[PDB]
Tab-separated table of C-alpha atoms in Angstrom:
chain	number	residue	atom	x	y	z
A	2	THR	CA	-182.223	-15.658	49.410
A	3	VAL	CA	-182.093	-13.929	52.806
A	4	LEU	CA	-179.456	-12.382	55.007
A	5	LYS	CA	-178.268	-14.610	57.855
A	6	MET	CA	-177.600	-13.435	61.394
A	7	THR	CA	-174.508	-15.673	61.505
A	8	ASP	CA	-172.934	-13.788	58.589
A	9	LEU	CA	-173.412	-10.416	60.306
A	10	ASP	CA	-171.164	-8.329	62.521
A	11	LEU	CA	-173.176	-7.787	65.712
A	12	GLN	CA	-170.558	-6.427	68.143
A	13	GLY	CA	-172.141	-3.642	70.190
A	14	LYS	CA	-175.253	-3.706	68.011
A	15	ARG	CA	-178.788	-3.924	69.344
A	16	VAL	CA	-180.403	-7.066	67.961
A	17	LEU	CA	-184.136	-7.789	68.167
A	18	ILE	CA	-184.735	-11.533	67.704
A	19	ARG	CA	-188.232	-12.842	67.032
A	20	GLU	CA	-188.193	-16.360	68.481
A	21	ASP	CA	-191.021	-18.888	68.754
A	22	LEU	CA	-191.294	-19.225	72.543
A	23	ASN	CA	-195.006	-20.078	72.468
A	24	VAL	CA	-194.723	-22.986	74.906
A	25	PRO	CA	-197.290	-24.682	77.179
A	26	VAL	CA	-197.640	-22.905	80.510
A	27	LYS	CA	-199.620	-23.905	83.594
A	28	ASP	CA	-199.938	-21.829	86.766
A	29	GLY	CA	-197.114	-19.531	85.696
A	30	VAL	CA	-194.718	-22.415	84.930
A	31	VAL	CA	-193.341	-23.642	81.616
A	32	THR	CA	-194.360	-27.301	81.285
A	33	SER	CA	-192.603	-28.095	77.983
A	34	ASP	CA	-189.632	-26.350	76.421
A	35	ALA	CA	-188.924	-27.823	72.958
A	36	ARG	CA	-189.472	-24.422	71.340
A	37	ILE	CA	-187.184	-22.741	73.879
A	38	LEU	CA	-184.498	-25.423	73.550
A	39	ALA	CA	-184.510	-24.995	69.761
A	40	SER	CA	-184.134	-21.189	70.059
A	41	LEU	CA	-181.379	-21.059	72.694
A	42	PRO	CA	-178.460	-21.582	70.248
A	43	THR	CA	-179.637	-18.485	68.351
A	44	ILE	CA	-179.775	-16.469	71.571
A	45	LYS	CA	-176.364	-17.754	72.673
A	46	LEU	CA	-174.715	-17.097	69.317
A	47	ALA	CA	-175.962	-13.487	69.195
A	48	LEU	CA	-174.575	-12.921	72.695
A	49	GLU	CA	-171.292	-14.561	71.694
A	50	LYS	CA	-171.224	-12.250	68.658
A	51	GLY	CA	-171.187	-9.209	70.953
A	52	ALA	CA	-174.833	-8.169	70.578
A	53	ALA	CA	-177.198	-6.362	72.926
A	54	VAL	CA	-179.995	-8.908	72.683
A	55	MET	CA	-183.747	-8.324	72.858
A	56	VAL	CA	-185.840	-11.478	72.483
A	57	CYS	CA	-189.519	-11.214	71.615
A	58	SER	CA	-192.213	-13.787	70.962
A	59	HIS	CA	-195.923	-14.436	71.068
A	60	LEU	CA	-197.689	-16.635	73.586
A	61	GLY	CA	-201.210	-17.822	72.834
A	62	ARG	CA	-203.720	-15.509	71.165
A	63	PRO	CA	-204.492	-12.936	73.876
A	64	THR	CA	-206.723	-9.911	73.495
A	65	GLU	CA	-204.755	-7.008	72.030
A	66	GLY	CA	-204.315	-3.959	74.242
A	67	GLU	CA	-204.900	-5.752	77.545
A	68	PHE	CA	-202.587	-7.430	80.009
A	69	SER	CA	-203.604	-11.095	80.452
A	70	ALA	CA	-201.492	-12.737	83.162
A	71	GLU	CA	-202.195	-16.201	81.751
A	72	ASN	CA	-200.527	-15.103	78.495
A	73	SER	CA	-197.574	-13.217	80.009
A	74	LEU	CA	-194.110	-14.362	78.983
A	75	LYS	CA	-192.861	-14.073	82.570
A	76	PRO	CA	-192.636	-17.908	82.866
A	77	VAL	CA	-190.306	-17.894	79.871
A	78	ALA	CA	-188.162	-15.224	81.562
A	79	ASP	CA	-187.971	-17.461	84.641
A	80	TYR	CA	-186.946	-20.329	82.360
A	81	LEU	CA	-184.329	-18.390	80.383
A	82	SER	CA	-182.721	-17.100	83.583
A	83	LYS	CA	-182.190	-20.671	84.785
A	84	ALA	CA	-181.113	-21.859	81.345
A	85	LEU	CA	-178.627	-19.003	80.834
A	86	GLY	CA	-177.249	-18.729	84.374
A	87	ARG	CA	-178.127	-15.027	84.555
A	88	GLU	CA	-181.107	-12.831	85.317
A	89	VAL	CA	-183.118	-12.442	82.119
A	90	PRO	CA	-185.564	-9.595	82.827
A	91	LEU	CA	-189.029	-9.516	81.357
A	92	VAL	CA	-189.449	-5.990	79.968
A	93	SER	CA	-193.097	-5.006	80.130
A	94	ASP	CA	-192.828	-1.529	78.632
A	95	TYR	CA	-190.378	-1.359	75.728
A	96	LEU	CA	-191.930	0.314	72.680
A	97	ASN	CA	-190.924	3.715	74.117
A	98	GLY	CA	-187.310	2.741	74.773
A	99	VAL	CA	-185.382	-0.083	76.445
A	100	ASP	CA	-181.975	-0.052	78.179
A	101	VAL	CA	-179.875	-3.052	77.175
A	102	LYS	CA	-176.104	-3.256	76.896
A	103	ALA	CA	-173.837	-5.292	74.674
A	104	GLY	CA	-173.530	-8.734	76.219
A	105	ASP	CA	-176.922	-8.516	77.952
A	106	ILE	CA	-180.282	-10.087	77.117
A	107	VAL	CA	-183.880	-9.144	77.934
A	108	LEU	CA	-187.206	-10.782	77.110
A	109	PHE	CA	-189.967	-8.533	75.824
A	110	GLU	CA	-193.448	-9.128	77.158
A	111	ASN	CA	-195.822	-10.960	74.771
A	112	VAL	CA	-195.858	-9.181	71.413
A	113	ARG	CA	-199.522	-10.041	70.995
A	114	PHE	CA	-200.537	-7.757	73.856
A	115	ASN	CA	-199.576	-4.863	71.550
A	116	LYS	CA	-202.406	-3.137	69.674
A	117	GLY	CA	-201.554	-3.507	65.991
A	118	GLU	CA	-199.545	-6.739	66.318
A	119	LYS	CA	-202.057	-9.036	64.653
A	120	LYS	CA	-202.834	-6.655	61.767
A	121	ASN	CA	-199.190	-5.611	61.156
A	122	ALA	CA	-199.630	-1.915	61.983
A	123	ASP	CA	-196.930	0.381	60.566
A	124	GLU	CA	-196.824	2.469	63.754
A	125	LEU	CA	-196.075	-0.655	65.818
A	126	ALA	CA	-193.668	-2.097	63.254
A	127	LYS	CA	-191.749	1.177	63.273
A	128	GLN	CA	-191.572	1.173	67.074
A	129	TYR	CA	-190.076	-2.331	67.064
A	130	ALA	CA	-187.606	-1.370	64.361
A	131	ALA	CA	-186.558	1.751	66.305
A	132	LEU	CA	-185.389	-0.409	69.211
A	133	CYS	CA	-182.649	-2.168	67.271
A	134	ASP	CA	-179.891	-1.989	64.680
A	135	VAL	CA	-180.647	-5.481	63.350
A	136	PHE	CA	-183.897	-7.422	63.254
A	137	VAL	CA	-183.593	-11.218	63.135
A	138	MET	CA	-186.576	-13.409	62.256
A	139	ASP	CA	-186.029	-16.838	63.887
A	140	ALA	CA	-189.629	-18.084	64.288
A	141	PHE	CA	-190.514	-20.332	61.349
A	142	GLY	CA	-193.684	-21.489	63.106
A	143	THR	CA	-195.106	-17.969	62.665
A	144	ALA	CA	-193.536	-17.180	59.276
A	145	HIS	CA	-196.888	-17.637	57.554
A	146	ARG	CA	-198.217	-14.560	59.421
A	147	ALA	CA	-197.659	-10.914	58.528
A	148	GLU	CA	-197.637	-9.543	62.060
A	149	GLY	CA	-195.936	-6.576	63.703
A	150	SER	CA	-192.966	-8.525	65.049
A	151	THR	CA	-192.793	-11.140	62.270
A	152	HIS	CA	-193.050	-8.936	59.192
A	153	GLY	CA	-193.702	-5.228	59.664
A	154	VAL	CA	-190.558	-4.745	61.758
A	155	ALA	CA	-188.476	-6.179	58.908
A	156	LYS	CA	-189.808	-3.480	56.552
A	157	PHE	CA	-188.293	-0.742	58.682
A	158	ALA	CA	-185.315	-2.182	60.551
A	159	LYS	CA	-181.936	-0.888	59.428
A	160	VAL	CA	-180.879	-4.500	58.760
A	161	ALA	CA	-183.251	-7.479	58.544
A	162	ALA	CA	-182.001	-11.054	58.567
A	163	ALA	CA	-183.014	-14.652	59.160
A	164	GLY	CA	-181.909	-16.506	62.251
A	165	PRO	CA	-180.069	-19.843	62.294
A	166	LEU	CA	-183.199	-21.847	63.159
A	167	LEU	CA	-185.304	-20.224	60.426
A	168	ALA	CA	-182.554	-20.870	57.883
A	169	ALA	CA	-182.207	-24.476	59.014
A	170	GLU	CA	-185.953	-25.119	58.660
A	171	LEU	CA	-186.060	-23.557	55.184
A	172	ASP	CA	-183.041	-25.692	54.246
A	173	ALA	CA	-184.519	-28.972	55.457
A	174	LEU	CA	-187.895	-28.274	53.853
A	175	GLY	CA	-186.133	-27.203	50.685
A	176	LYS	CA	-184.299	-30.543	50.809
A	177	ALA	CA	-187.500	-32.575	51.119
A	178	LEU	CA	-189.662	-30.541	48.709
A	179	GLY	CA	-187.341	-28.840	46.196
A	180	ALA	CA	-185.922	-31.865	44.383
A	181	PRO	CA	-186.027	-34.753	46.846
A	182	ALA	CA	-184.008	-37.925	46.571
A	183	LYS	CA	-186.331	-40.494	44.944
A	184	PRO	CA	-188.456	-42.341	45.618
A	185	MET	CA	-190.185	-39.884	47.952
A	186	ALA	CA	-193.046	-40.984	50.197
A	187	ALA	CA	-195.458	-38.633	51.966
A	188	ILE	CA	-197.877	-39.613	54.728
A	189	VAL	CA	-200.809	-37.213	55.016
A	190	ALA	CA	-203.631	-37.787	57.500
A	191	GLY	CA	-206.520	-35.646	58.665
A	192	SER	CA	-210.244	-35.578	59.069
A	193	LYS	CA	-210.995	-34.122	55.608
A	194	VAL	CA	-209.576	-33.979	52.099
A	195	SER	CA	-211.211	-30.561	51.773
A	196	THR	CA	-209.230	-29.098	54.666
A	197	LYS	CA	-205.848	-30.397	53.407
A	198	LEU	CA	-206.664	-30.201	49.687
A	199	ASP	CA	-203.835	-27.737	49.037
A	200	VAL	CA	-201.379	-29.990	50.900
A	201	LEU	CA	-202.517	-33.062	48.971
A	202	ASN	CA	-202.460	-31.395	45.550
A	203	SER	CA	-199.009	-29.897	46.136
A	204	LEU	CA	-197.556	-33.211	47.312
A	205	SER	CA	-199.195	-34.990	44.344
A	206	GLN	CA	-196.804	-33.039	42.108
A	207	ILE	CA	-193.768	-33.782	44.313
A	208	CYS	CA	-193.862	-37.206	45.919
A	209	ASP	CA	-193.904	-40.664	44.344
A	210	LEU	CA	-196.043	-42.426	46.979
A	211	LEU	CA	-198.892	-40.730	48.870
A	212	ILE	CA	-199.994	-42.686	51.950
A	213	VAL	CA	-203.207	-41.166	53.251
A	214	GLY	CA	-204.662	-41.687	56.718
A	215	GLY	CA	-207.694	-40.853	58.805
A	216	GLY	CA	-210.719	-39.245	57.197
A	217	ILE	CA	-208.628	-38.384	54.152
A	218	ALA	CA	-208.147	-42.140	53.687
A	219	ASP	CA	-211.882	-42.757	54.078
A	220	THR	CA	-212.653	-40.476	51.127
A	221	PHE	CA	-210.005	-42.177	48.968
A	222	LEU	CA	-211.403	-45.592	49.956
A	223	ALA	CA	-214.923	-44.425	49.123
A	224	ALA	CA	-213.734	-42.916	45.827
A	225	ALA	CA	-212.352	-46.339	44.913
A	226	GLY	CA	-215.692	-47.972	45.695
A	227	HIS	CA	-214.737	-49.437	49.039
A	228	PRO	CA	-217.091	-49.574	52.046
A	229	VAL	CA	-216.091	-47.266	54.904
A	230	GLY	CA	-219.099	-47.814	57.196
A	231	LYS	CA	-219.597	-45.223	59.934
A	232	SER	CA	-216.448	-43.274	59.074
A	233	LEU	CA	-216.316	-39.650	57.997
A	234	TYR	CA	-215.912	-39.079	54.288
A	235	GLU	CA	-216.763	-36.322	51.828
A	236	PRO	CA	-218.873	-37.565	48.891
A	237	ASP	CA	-218.416	-34.204	47.162
A	238	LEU	CA	-214.615	-34.653	47.156
A	239	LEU	CA	-214.721	-38.137	45.588
A	240	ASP	CA	-213.821	-36.885	42.104
A	241	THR	CA	-211.001	-34.768	43.539
A	242	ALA	CA	-209.495	-37.781	45.325
A	243	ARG	CA	-209.703	-39.813	42.113
A	244	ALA	CA	-207.939	-36.981	40.286
A	245	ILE	CA	-205.206	-36.977	42.956
A	246	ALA	CA	-204.841	-40.763	42.755
A	247	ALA	CA	-204.435	-40.335	38.989
A	248	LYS	CA	-201.584	-37.853	39.527
A	249	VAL	CA	-199.651	-39.863	42.140
A	250	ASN	CA	-199.661	-43.426	43.468
A	251	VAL	CA	-201.987	-43.565	46.480
A	252	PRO	CA	-201.794	-47.099	47.937
A	253	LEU	CA	-204.991	-47.970	49.636
A	254	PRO	CA	-205.403	-50.118	52.773
A	255	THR	CA	-205.982	-53.778	52.137
A	256	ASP	CA	-207.029	-54.338	55.779
A	257	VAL	CA	-208.248	-52.142	58.640
A	258	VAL	CA	-209.018	-52.234	62.370
A	259	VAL	CA	-212.658	-51.448	63.130
A	260	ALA	CA	-214.886	-51.030	66.152
A	261	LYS	CA	-218.609	-50.324	66.345
A	262	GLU	CA	-218.243	-48.059	69.403
A	263	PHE	CA	-215.962	-47.011	72.272
A	264	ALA	CA	-217.332	-49.181	75.108
A	265	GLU	CA	-216.179	-51.989	77.399
A	266	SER	CA	-218.329	-54.490	75.463
A	267	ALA	CA	-216.854	-53.598	72.052
A	268	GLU	CA	-214.033	-55.529	70.421
A	269	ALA	CA	-211.491	-54.097	67.988
A	270	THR	CA	-211.412	-56.257	64.836
A	271	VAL	CA	-209.205	-56.600	61.772
A	272	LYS	CA	-211.184	-56.904	58.555
A	273	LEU	CA	-210.344	-56.835	54.893
A	274	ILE	CA	-211.426	-53.525	53.386
A	275	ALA	CA	-214.279	-55.236	51.494
A	276	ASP	CA	-215.759	-56.619	54.745
A	277	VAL	CA	-216.222	-53.317	56.619
A	278	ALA	CA	-219.805	-53.304	57.945
A	279	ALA	CA	-222.102	-50.285	57.631
A	280	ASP	CA	-221.792	-49.662	61.389
A	281	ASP	CA	-218.015	-50.254	61.633
A	282	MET	CA	-215.714	-47.311	62.334
A	283	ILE	CA	-212.348	-47.493	60.547
A	284	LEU	CA	-209.916	-46.598	63.322
A	285	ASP	CA	-206.503	-47.925	62.190
A	286	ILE	CA	-204.874	-49.585	59.235
A	287	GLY	CA	-204.619	-53.346	59.516
A	288	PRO	CA	-201.471	-55.390	59.975
A	289	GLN	CA	-201.076	-56.389	56.305
A	290	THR	CA	-201.449	-52.756	55.229
A	291	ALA	CA	-198.953	-51.715	57.926
A	292	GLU	CA	-196.421	-54.282	56.709
A	293	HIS	CA	-196.820	-53.191	53.079
A	294	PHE	CA	-196.526	-49.502	54.013
A	295	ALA	CA	-193.459	-50.196	56.176
A	296	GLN	CA	-191.694	-51.848	53.244
A	297	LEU	CA	-192.527	-48.837	51.057
A	298	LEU	CA	-191.106	-46.433	53.620
A	299	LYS	CA	-187.834	-48.309	53.960
A	300	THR	CA	-187.395	-48.192	50.159
A	301	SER	CA	-187.904	-44.409	50.061
A	302	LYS	CA	-184.987	-41.974	50.079
A	303	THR	CA	-187.227	-39.089	51.273
A	304	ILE	CA	-190.150	-39.245	53.709
A	305	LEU	CA	-192.573	-36.433	54.539
A	306	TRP	CA	-194.566	-37.501	57.623
A	307	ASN	CA	-197.757	-35.499	58.263
A	308	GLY	CA	-200.073	-37.690	60.324
A	309	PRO	CA	-200.771	-40.947	62.147
A	310	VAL	CA	-202.700	-43.717	60.439
A	311	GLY	CA	-204.916	-44.643	63.405
A	312	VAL	CA	-206.291	-43.406	66.707
A	313	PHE	CA	-203.010	-44.481	68.262
A	314	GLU	CA	-203.645	-43.283	71.814
A	315	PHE	CA	-205.700	-46.488	71.909
A	316	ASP	CA	-203.275	-49.405	71.717
A	317	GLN	CA	-205.862	-51.469	69.838
A	318	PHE	CA	-205.758	-48.726	67.183
A	319	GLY	CA	-202.048	-47.990	67.533
A	320	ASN	CA	-200.369	-50.801	65.586
A	321	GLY	CA	-200.519	-49.040	62.231
A	322	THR	CA	-198.792	-45.896	63.533
A	323	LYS	CA	-196.329	-47.845	65.687
A	324	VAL	CA	-195.256	-49.900	62.673
A	325	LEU	CA	-195.007	-46.814	60.448
A	326	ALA	CA	-193.030	-44.836	63.032
A	327	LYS	CA	-190.595	-47.711	63.440
A	328	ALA	CA	-190.275	-48.078	59.660
A	329	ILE	CA	-189.476	-44.387	59.269
A	330	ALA	CA	-186.984	-44.701	62.126
A	331	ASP	CA	-185.315	-47.686	60.418
A	332	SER	CA	-185.402	-46.202	56.914
A	333	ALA	CA	-182.324	-44.775	55.207
A	334	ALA	CA	-184.503	-41.915	53.910
A	335	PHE	CA	-184.168	-38.304	54.893
A	336	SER	CA	-187.329	-37.922	56.971
A	337	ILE	CA	-189.123	-34.750	57.925
A	338	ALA	CA	-192.168	-34.733	60.179
A	339	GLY	CA	-194.706	-32.049	61.033
A	340	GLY	CA	-198.063	-31.642	62.693
A	341	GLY	CA	-199.106	-31.968	66.309
A	342	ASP	CA	-200.433	-35.515	66.096
A	343	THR	CA	-197.280	-36.580	64.270
A	344	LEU	CA	-195.011	-35.177	66.965
A	345	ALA	CA	-197.177	-36.877	69.577
A	346	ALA	CA	-196.692	-40.130	67.696
A	347	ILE	CA	-192.946	-39.526	67.445
A	348	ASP	CA	-192.813	-38.934	71.201
A	349	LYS	CA	-194.989	-41.920	72.097
A	350	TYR	CA	-193.027	-44.452	70.073
A	351	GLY	CA	-189.640	-42.904	70.906
A	352	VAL	CA	-188.170	-42.395	67.406
A	353	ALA	CA	-187.364	-38.676	67.587
A	354	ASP	CA	-183.597	-39.315	67.346
A	355	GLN	CA	-184.179	-41.232	64.105
A	356	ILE	CA	-186.159	-38.530	62.256
A	357	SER	CA	-183.959	-36.315	60.111
A	358	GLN	CA	-185.894	-33.097	60.826
A	359	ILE	CA	-188.866	-32.465	63.129
A	360	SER	CA	-190.704	-29.212	62.382
A	361	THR	CA	-192.388	-27.694	65.458
A	362	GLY	CA	-194.438	-25.078	63.561
A	363	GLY	CA	-197.438	-26.960	62.126
A	364	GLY	CA	-199.349	-24.183	60.375
A	365	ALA	CA	-196.316	-22.638	58.709
A	366	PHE	CA	-195.061	-26.150	57.952
A	367	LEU	CA	-198.234	-26.939	55.983
A	368	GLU	CA	-198.169	-23.585	54.165
A	369	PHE	CA	-194.601	-24.296	53.018
A	370	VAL	CA	-195.641	-27.806	51.893
A	371	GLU	CA	-198.579	-26.244	49.969
A	372	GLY	CA	-196.234	-24.030	47.964
A	373	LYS	CA	-197.444	-20.808	49.619
A	374	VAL	CA	-195.417	-17.631	49.981
A	375	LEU	CA	-194.426	-17.172	53.620
A	376	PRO	CA	-194.784	-13.415	54.282
A	377	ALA	CA	-192.005	-13.396	56.912
A	378	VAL	CA	-189.587	-14.933	54.408
A	379	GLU	CA	-190.849	-12.696	51.603
A	380	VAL	CA	-190.081	-9.487	53.458
A	381	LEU	CA	-186.562	-10.749	54.213
A	382	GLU	CA	-186.002	-11.536	50.532
A	383	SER	CA	-187.203	-8.088	49.467
A	384	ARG	CA	-184.861	-6.360	51.917
A	385	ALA	CA	-181.821	-8.292	50.652
A	386	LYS	CA	-182.416	-7.470	46.969
A	387	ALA	CA	-183.194	-3.743	47.365
């Protein structure tokens, strides 16, 4: 339970809003704005509520204590000025005081230039908190970090609350992971079981079908005694995968698309799983597997989508993910999706409108799926109780 900015009285109050404005930038220009688009209703509501608004965010992982022009938020100030129809100044020196009136908005320079940001320094947290009456955390994609402007500031601000976007992401994730409508399917892909072990084990206690992809799928295929050829798997994790497959239904591919190499002389071939050669690379699920998986997805009432099932930027290895994306788009289930490759797949196959919730903050998304405490949410919950 956290305080909500929407439930607050903000008229004439100085409001520091931590947004996730960490967008691609090239040559001083924003080249994609999904994170900014998502945050703008928060910014607009605070202004409508009578606030003096200070927006802050990170950009990249610059060196603390230096100005790095490539990491400056000036392109986001340019963008916000055109989006809001008003000059939105970038404020490059603010920890010692900033002049902002009710009804106005400024954009702080990159919080990660500040010495003490990454390690959550009290001195820095207190300087943030001194600039405002209310601190609002609205950046779910950084909620897994205890940093000066994501966590420390909320220790010391007079009032500390969640923003509308943070609350909405916690709600949707709570919907999919708290007690989901059954049956619940999860798709988890990646290069290694070991690197997503916490995700897999958590979902094993939550979902009813666990569709694995990529190198995770190779280890499950190996653990079942299937040949995976020249495809990455972890022999040491074989017992773990078998334990996971004992806890939850993990359907395995019945057919796959293989190639020996990426070359103009190579052909992409569908084989049954038993016929994978020792020099074949497993690069997509096969058409029978894709049909079976699609039928499973359209029977589910909840879908967690965390990964493609093939190297889909190659069309010869894209059928599995195309079919699965379309199935999720057609399915009656509440679907949530997260992870960079997943969003790329959603964009490529044009199903974004048909996904119930698309999380843009991968790392914090996975931590929430794993059952981890999110420090940014934790500090908000402690403030509310006290």
